[PDB]
């Protein structure tokens, strides 16, 4: 059932409500996503407020049902399960050295879109740190997505490791920690361990006057054979 709506493209929009070391601000998101090729195509804006992080820390949070799961795995896609109800995404971001993100999102069908609306809270972070002093490339690594069943809370835990490359020509770790319940009360599929392999590209709209980031990525199911 789930599944069946992710046969094509689908619109996605995004929301993000943030405010990190009391700094608040608002990012909106749209574009669409193909599950077919696990490729999302998106754009954010900065609505309000002042950017206070480098773009790169909010890639994670800013919708893992666009994942492509080869036939082999489709019993283990606890993303497309959910929908249309749809899950609560809550996550701790550790920046080795500085300061944590917490989130909590939505993300469901509002009708014929795909909507993920996002709550951020960063605490902790260093004035002159890499992440408040700006000092992260806007770049973005390939990482592998660690899932396992969560039979408990009829979820998912997730956990990995972003490597944020830095301006000096080190990398700035952020080690998320994740888990996924569904909204609705409808069965789920619970998965087997497997991982998602990630890969994104940042870029600019040259006929963008806000602080924005355009976003390419391509997302595939793995580990299972």
């Not at 929301?15 to 998101?29: A, I, P």
């Not at 994942?67 to 609560?88: N, T």
């Not at 971001?93 to 993920?116: H, Q």
Request: with cysteine; net charge negative; proline share 4%.
């Amino acid at each position: 059932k789930g599944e069946e709506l992710f046969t094509g493209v689908v619109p996605i929009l995004v929301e993000l409500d943030g405010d990190v070391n009391g700094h608040k601000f608002s990012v909106s998101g749209e574009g669409e996503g193909d599950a077919t090729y696990g490729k999302l195509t998106l754009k954010f804006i900065l609505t309000t407020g002042k950017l206070p992080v480098p773009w790169p820390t909010l890639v994670t949070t800013l919708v893992q049902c666009f994942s492509r799961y080869p036939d082999h795995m489709k019993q283990h896609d606890f993303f497309k399960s959910a929908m249309p109800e749809g899950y609560v995404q809550e996550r701790t971001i550790f920046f080795k050295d500085d300061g944590n993100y917490k989130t909590r999102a939505e993300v469901k069908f509002e009708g014929d879109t795909l909507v993920n609306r996002i709550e951020l809270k960063g605490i902790d972070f260093k004035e002159d740190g890499n992440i408040l002093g700006h000092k992260l490339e806007y770049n973005y690594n390939s990482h592998n997505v660690y899932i396992m069943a969560d039979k408990q809370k009829n979820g998912i835990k997730v956990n990995f490791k972003i490597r944020h490359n830095i301006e000096d020509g080190c990398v700035q770790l952020a080690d998320h920690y994740q888990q996924n319940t569904p909204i609705g009360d409808g069965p789920v599929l619970l998965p087997d361990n497997h991982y998602l392999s990630t890969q994104s590209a940042l870029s600019k709209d040259p006929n963008e006057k806000r602080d924005h980031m355009v976003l390419l990525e391509f997302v595939t199911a793995a580990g299972i054979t």
